[PDB]
């Protein structure tokens, strides 16, 4: 609890409490109560009182006697399915005999995680959207703030901060078509039964699970899913990646926080936001080994990867939510200092428009002629420590062919950022 | 080299040798040229001469000249480049100028990584689909072969070995399905320069972008993404969800040769394919640790993430590659033993037919009479060690019912398999 | 909640709770202050009320107010120093001030985390010492009980329970060892202010620690370590060697619970003991790569990895006190059905002695000629579907050396079982 | 072979080459023929032709028809075995008889394995050894050199570049003693036979393990550990340790390289180094999570869980001495630039030193009254935009105290260092 709210995010984290859980199997057993009634399995009458006591079997289940229960059969489903009994028995004695009708504890547990897993998806996935949104809004409004771009964590050729906001934004976009097409494969319903037979439904299996699915809303599958897993693990793969995605963002804006760099600063000096996504970055690709390895699962129904599950899962789920809280704090209330980004570009005394000089030369010079002259007064700059434009600018050779004004244009960063507006609009425009 | 012919796949395993990585690099040079040469920014003539010169460099490359200067330049690149100058130099002093104009070590890195992502993606999806093939027509031949469902692996209800083939295949159509969505996305060119900008190519940048992709038959995308890696980490994703269906499969079939069980063999006694299929299943999951760490890259080049992919990428699609090699030639040669099927099935005297007898008497006896009856025969049943269908059938309420004939049929596997059939109808049908 | 009953162990959850962490925090600022009044940096009046104060701060604190604040200031202590101060406060304005005398929030933090695993290791440990225990009497008590040896999952040559249980002791044993060696290392107390420099206390900076390590019988280190984390993973490193151990018999009893081995059985048919211990033997793994990446830490005080541990080092405790308290059920209550163990044996109809009848055969006849007997009469009785013995008895140049009587000792899994004796012994004498 | 320049370290790359694996396994089959000759199990005629056809088998052995053999047997030792017989056979044909006798695969392999990890171990210790020493030398050297301590990459007090060394430093001391202490316990050898039992080699079996230990000069364990794989994972685990260590030292390095930053710098700008260090980083934490599975074995020999090792331990070891190669060359030729240390003290104008104003201001003010009047005058000096020390300065309260030199000297970062020095020499004598 007291890491809850460092980590996490509320929303998602009740989704996966112990309550919601609970919740979400009482909703399954309905359903499936329902969806049999209307096939003629059972009858009307019992359906209806199940529908009814269930609206409040939440307040009425014992969570201690649950969990102490749970230990002993090795999963939550078998003790659950107990107490719901007791508990429309004590409203029809009759009603409780077709309560978990032809289902196994997998399918309940499968059924309940799926819906879990359409409620978080529908929560990140906002937290995705309005990310993007955000990041494509301060790339315009940055997309001349200059400032330098950094490879191997070295000052290098000028970039925009625009620039970086919108290879973000693009990455969110990346992300939205991600969720947009797992969607119709992965929330499906599980409904198979012991052995994924529907044996005890006898002929009227695949009527059944039909209206099954219907009934919650979920796609149905060709054929039971408990032992192969792809769905699930589909599922934390792109949350990985989601988390991967601001978990660069964070290292970026941290480093621009350096005391000596000062560039850009996290809402009101601290990172807290950034200390919470870099370890949900750590974290997540741990629990993705975890979700990978429990592919592996015997015969019909497994032991040990099955159960893994159901430990790994919520945990990416709410690191990856809670991390989106954070990057969008951010990226809303974002600090940018313009004059730390003038002065860190003064940091080298024009040594790095080195390469600027030699393209506007190459023209009336040769480009080999051209790489000659700037090379040698980067050297006299460097010995006299003085700025490179002070250096070129009493170069013979290249006085023939610039004026001081032309010079101090070429010296500009701004004049040296190739097709960066040309990727801006590229980005705004797949909006 | 010797474990090379243990895990992983021949043509894969070539795809990401020194060799084809060089091969590749300089296939992304020649691109660069025509591409320039085709929008004006370099002469002509100076591409066809890179063109014809490349066309014999990779046998002219001193690789032990390159694999020295790797280490001290940090990347193939930087060394790679001097020498394919120095190699079109001896034909043309002045095409020479135009080699790796206005390009970074990180797109020709990026570009070769993603040509061999191509290359080796259509052999896997082939494999794949060779995988679904097989299966479906295995599950085909054997929809009606009866044998023992297994959950926590212990015996529980009977299903077919038909019903497995059909869910392996059914997995398999999900990751053709998963291989053709990502293509368009992940399957693009990279070419930014230092930071991304394309500053020296001034104001060409977009159009020598396009023509670029366009030569390679690769997509084009909106920014420049050598510090967003998620293209990269879908594509390890989706190979390792392939590696954990076949790991499942492996998991199966050696249980199942056991010699207590001895139901299904690997082609010629031991399970050399599992062996090797689950060292993948292993191996690939820690992998994806590292790729997903991989994405917490520094601003405009990382240190260490990005170099990190170079190692881990290419491991994960030999040992998926090399996991599926083997995972069909069992699918092919799979041997069954449909007699050890039957007597395993015998194994508990009937007790496993317990709840099929149950569900025959509940209509002309009511469920609690009929699970009440089942019960003490069963009592009987293990106290006597004989066949529950002897208790049964001297039980005066169900003599009343059913005649010797009558509880035979009761008593088969086959007739206890629900909707089963339909499952294994509707995978052939996706189809 | 509901799913610590399933994986983790009542104590060492009880250890890592929200609640006992303050406790221990508070247990570290009431040595920090007796240390500092022993020495003369603070005056021992003060130091009394807050030893005094400290026995009800936990009553006082609100957990709500904290988790909130937690949030905000990116860790539990800042927020717990202002309530623990004011609460100090309402008892003497002037004990007050002395409150975390030149502390730093990390000192307070790894202390606690130290002092938590103190007491969790006590637990663990003694845990290892009753499984240690109780494999070294099973081990003797079934020295004598033959059963198949499995290589590749098949049948290969016979073995005795009381050598698997040896083999387990001696695991145990080992780690009993590691347990014992880390201690002196790794239980060291941390107190080194913002920057480990202990900068506010002056020149009273040893002479303070040295003290405030007594204070609470931690060892003392040479210098701080914030940033140096070898000391957290080595201790997770050892946790999950453990895991691992109980993951290896888990894996092993439940194959011999599968319906057709039936060879030994979890105590009082689903082995819920071994799914739980498998998901931890899943599970720690992963934590492993998380606990071992936070090693990466920035400076003087580190952005995410930091954080990250503060996740993963109790989940690993908690996993491997669960499966080993699962573990210690299993060894003591393990049913062993010792005919279903001599069935087994007979399932190759002899095929497996072969390799012991031509080492009896060798001296009589020569390896090479026994050889060819043995691989002749293998055929024999593979085509004839008899028992070995029943081929290799009539076979005349065998009945030139040995009786009926002499044929059937030959035949017995007893008398091919090497020095597994010898090594059971060796390993009851480690002890 | 590419890579092999950037990331690993050449003698650890030739211990685990096919070349030296194979090489290896000769010499466990001579120890074996050796010690078994010197007991009477095979005549020491044999020992001596297979003693003397061994010195040049690696030269007969067809690495090819190996590679080929190897992925259809399922391991290197059975084709292996194959041609040494052969190549023995080619000597005297009777010798031949006794190659491998008693032995089974797993046994040459773990012992080769072990081998392997003995001289590998020398090697990495020598190395660190040599980066300890280094450390220690350069702590020493830099002790007075001053420089901002950084705490969630934000300036915050100041430390020396010497208090960082003798961090490092101690932090691999504790790593050779690490290495000292696993050394008894992991390095023994392997040879229990088909199921751990030597059953073929009837009741001379503990009297040949003996004496194999002994000819290979490695411990004899008390009982087969084929499926019992502590010892294999507690190698990875120190492994993993010490590359944890140095990516910590990567990381601050990297980080002091920083253009604006620039206090220290890689020998003869990128960080070469640092880029293979953190990458490796990266790899080995997810290299562990696959050891640490690896130990879920089945029964005597496992299917999947020990293929792996022969894939995860060599990378492992390879890594971490690449790694300390690198390290070693950074901490001997490391460049320091003293003037840059100097001007980042200065960076935030006096603020950092707030806290050693307000101590030497407690005494004569009260504390209460120190702070208070420090904090006026950061406000002041911020919003002046004038060094703190200007500030302060002329503020009444505070002349009354102290003359203008007093404050020069509470206003310098030697001022306040705490117990730095007494750190330090700590770390010198644990030496």
Same mark, same amino acid.
């Given at each position: ?29 309905? *359903? $499936? %109560?329902?969806? =049999?009634? #209307? !096939? ?5 009458? +019992?359906?209806?009182?199940? @529908? ?67 409620? *978080? $998806? %529908?929560?990140? =996935?906002? #937290? !995705? ?5 955000? +990041?494509?809004?301060?790339? @315009? ?69 039909? %209206? ?220």
């Amino acid at each position: 609890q007291l890491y809850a709210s460092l980590f996490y995010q509320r929303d998602v984290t009740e989704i996966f409490s112990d309550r919601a859980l609970v919740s979400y199997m009482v909703e399954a057993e309905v *359903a $499936l %109560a329902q969806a =049999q009634a #209307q !096939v003629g399995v059972i009858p009307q009458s +019992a359906a209806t009182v199940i @529908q009814r006591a269930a609206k409040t079997a939440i307040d009425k289940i014992d969570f201690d006697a649950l969990a102490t229960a749970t230990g002993l059969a090795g999963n939550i489903a078998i003790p659950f399915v107990k107490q719901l009994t007791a508990i429309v028995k004590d409203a029809d004695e009759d009603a409780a005999r077709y309560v978990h009708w032809g289902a196994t504890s997998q399918d309940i547990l499968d059924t309940a995680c799926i819906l879990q897993c359409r409620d *978080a $998806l %529908a929560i990140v =996935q906002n #937290q !995705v959207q309005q990310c993007y949104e955000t +990041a494509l809004s301060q790339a @315009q409004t940055y997309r001349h703030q200059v400032m330098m771009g950094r490879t191997w964590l070295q000052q290098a050729l000028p970039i925009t901060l625009g620039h970086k906001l919108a290879r973000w934004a693009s990455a969110f976009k990346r992300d939205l078509d991600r969720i947009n097409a797992i969607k119709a494969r992965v929330l499906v319903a599980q409904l198979g039964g012991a052995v994924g037979s529907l044996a005890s439904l006898q002929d009227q299996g695949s009527i059944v699970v039909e %209206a099954y699915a219907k009934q919650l809303k979920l796609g149905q599958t060709a054929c039971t899913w408990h032992g192969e897993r792809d769905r699930i693990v589909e599922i934390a793969s792109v949350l990985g990646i989601i988390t991967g995605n601001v978990g660069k963002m964070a290292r970026d804006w941290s480093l621009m926080m350096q005391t000596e760099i000062a560039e850009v600063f996290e809402p009101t000096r601290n990172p807290v936001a950034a200390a919470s996504v870099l370890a949900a970055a750590n974290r997540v690709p741990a629990l993705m080994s975890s979700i990978y390895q429990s592919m592996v699962q015997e015969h019909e129904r497994s032991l040990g990867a099955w159960h893994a599950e159901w430990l790994s899962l919520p945990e990416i789920f709410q690191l990856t939510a809670g991390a989106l809280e954070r990057t969008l704090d951010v990226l809303k209330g974002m600090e940018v200092n313009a004059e730390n980004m003038h002065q860190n570009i003064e940091c080298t005394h024009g040594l790095i428009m080195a390469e600027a000089v030699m393209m506007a030369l190459a023209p009336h010079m040769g480009r080999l002629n051209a790489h000659h002259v700037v090379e040698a007064a980067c050297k006299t700059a460097v010995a006299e420590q003085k700025h490179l434009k002070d250096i070129i600018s009493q170069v013979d050779e290249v006085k023939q062919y610039f004026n001081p004004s032309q010079l101090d244009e070429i010296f500009k960063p701004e004049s040296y950022l190739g097709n960066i507006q040309d990727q801006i609009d590229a980005v705004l425009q797949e909006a």
